[PDB]
Amino acid sequence: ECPKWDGLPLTVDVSATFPEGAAVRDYYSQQIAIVKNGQIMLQPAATSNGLLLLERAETDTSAPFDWHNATVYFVLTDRFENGDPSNDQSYGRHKDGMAEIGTFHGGDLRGLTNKLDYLQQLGVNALWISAPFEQIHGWVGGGTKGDFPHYAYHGYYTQDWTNLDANMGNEADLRTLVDSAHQRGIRILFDVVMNHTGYATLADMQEYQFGALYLSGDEVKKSLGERWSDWKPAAGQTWHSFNDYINFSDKTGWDKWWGKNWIRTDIGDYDNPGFDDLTMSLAFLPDIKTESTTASGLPVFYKNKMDTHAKAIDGYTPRDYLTHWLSQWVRDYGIDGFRVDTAKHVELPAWQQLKTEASAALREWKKANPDKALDDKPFWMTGEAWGHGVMQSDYYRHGFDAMINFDYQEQAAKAVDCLAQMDTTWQQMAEKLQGFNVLSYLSSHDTRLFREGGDKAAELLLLAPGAVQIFYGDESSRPFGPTGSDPLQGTRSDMNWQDVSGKSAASVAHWQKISQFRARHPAIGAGKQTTLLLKQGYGFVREHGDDKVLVVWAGQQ
Ligand SMILES: [Ca+2]
Ligand SMILES: [Ca+2]
């Protein structure tokens, strides 16, 4: 079934697609062929995996930006590039000195800035960065076995949506990142959370005077230290054992935290979690009362956090606060979009509200900044709803321009040793997505890293219809990292920069060529597909607007 290949030049019927005598470039090898009998004959480049990325040779620059063609690069900032090591251990955070599974390694906004020319060479149109908001300051026990201290190095444990986390940089650093990204054609997505707050941690309890301990008076100082967060497991204990100093029952102490009006939780005297998706608690993270219709005031512990930018606003609910707070980042910096976490676990009119206010914020920034706005496009919003597929679901009606597509990973794993197998999926996706966008990927921070087939991953991904998501280090086969007893941890390992210019430089160049080809033809991500019948191999035509491409794979070997 799967096509085999001579290893010798390759003859193609371009008779339907390209005029006669016209010049056709193979973007990969750069060879230009003139059509003779409705035919061209090209030898694919050695590093090509049998591909010919046939474009009209008149094309000479990247196509205007379209979300339906977008190449989104998703980075965990702390794990990417350390531009500033003076901010690596903010708020008393330490490294663990034992594998660093869950510590802040130090990646920050200035380093990510440094790396923008690299990213545009990779054909990246959108930069999805992990939430830069101020996280919980300390750590919880990591893995099922208390194997390591787990901090908020990934941005999902937000504590104050109005501040930057000091590990990330300051306001000047964010603005420099966003404006350098825009000057290079790269839009900025923030990763965003409204379902939950971060965990309670020893560092935060000590710093903002909330919660409660079993220890009293001098026992606190005798067992915990001057800095409670600095605790280490004793003999036979694990990193979960610090819980046994914390009294999670105590009403008075735990009411001085977020507040009964803000969250549901087993802790203290708070409304307890529910059993449906909206009101349940994931991984014992407290669920925010997004549906509450009653004015809540600030989180109670903000009384003790003098450096917050949050201000009480008459009649606002928790939802109102979150959507105002999120929107200010857009209004002040011109963020282009949000990727929304745990979207199944918050009611849909809350996301719609978030989208309403974020769009007004982006419009308002672009009007204030006509020199910095690349264009007039509205705010964009994508969402992680677990296991969503290629369907225009209810999410589309409530503010989501595109959902993350979980079904592509397995579809691409099937076609590792035969690009041709993607055809079915590629036909359906090209058809279906004439009416809506999705975001597809190979590697995820909460699934696995796609490392089969080496750099074949490139064409498995970048040829997808719809917007695609390069998980950072896909281009360089970034290894799965230390993980301990949390199976997902190794997916968040350091970018392998040494490999980028050494052992993996060929993989990166392969990715570069295929991704530039995509950036150069909106037909790839948005066109309709006709699959060709050829004498040797697999191939297809994509066509959208006035843009046609022909993509041919020779065969195995
Ligand atoms: Ca740093
Ligand atoms: Ca919820």
Numbering used by the authors: 120 to 676
Provide excerpts from the study:
MalS is an α-amylase that breaks down maltodextrins in the periplasm, hydrolyzing the 1,4-glucosidic bond of amylose and long maltodextrin to release maltohexaose. According to the carbohydrate-active enzymes (CAZy) database, MalS is classified as a member of GH13_19. MalS is an integral component of the maltose utilization pathway in Escherichia coli, crucial to the effective utilization of maltodextrin. MalS degrades linear dextrins by recognizing the substrate at the non-reducing end and preferentially liberating maltohexaose.
The crystal structure of MalS, a periplasmic α-amylase from E.coli strain K12, was determined at a resolution of 2.7 Å. Most of the polypeptide chains had well-defined electron densities, except for residues 1–119, which were not visible in the electron map. MalS consists of four domains: domain A (residues 181–314, 436–645), domain B (residues 315–435), domain C (residues 120–180, 646–676), and the non-visible domain N (residues 1–119). The conventional C-domain of amylase consists of amino acids 120–180 (N-terminal) and 646–676 (C-terminal) in MalS, and the whole domain architecture shows the complete circular permutation of C-A-B-A-C in domain order. The MalS structure has clear disulfide bridges between C121 and C537, located in domains C and A. Based on high electron densities and coordination geometry, we identified two calcium ion positions in the MalS structure. Ca2 is located in domain A, while Ca1 is located between domains A and B. Ca2 is situated at the back of the active center, whereas Ca1 is located near the -3, -4 subsite binding loop. In MalS, Ca1 was located around the -3, -4 subunit binding loop, and thus it stabilized the loop formed by residues 397–406 and participated in substrate binding at the active site. Similar to the catalytic action of common amylases, D460 acts as a nucleophile, E503 as a proton donor, and D565 as a transition state stabilizer. By docking the substrate to MalS, we confirmed that MalS has a binding pocket capable of containing 6 glucose units.
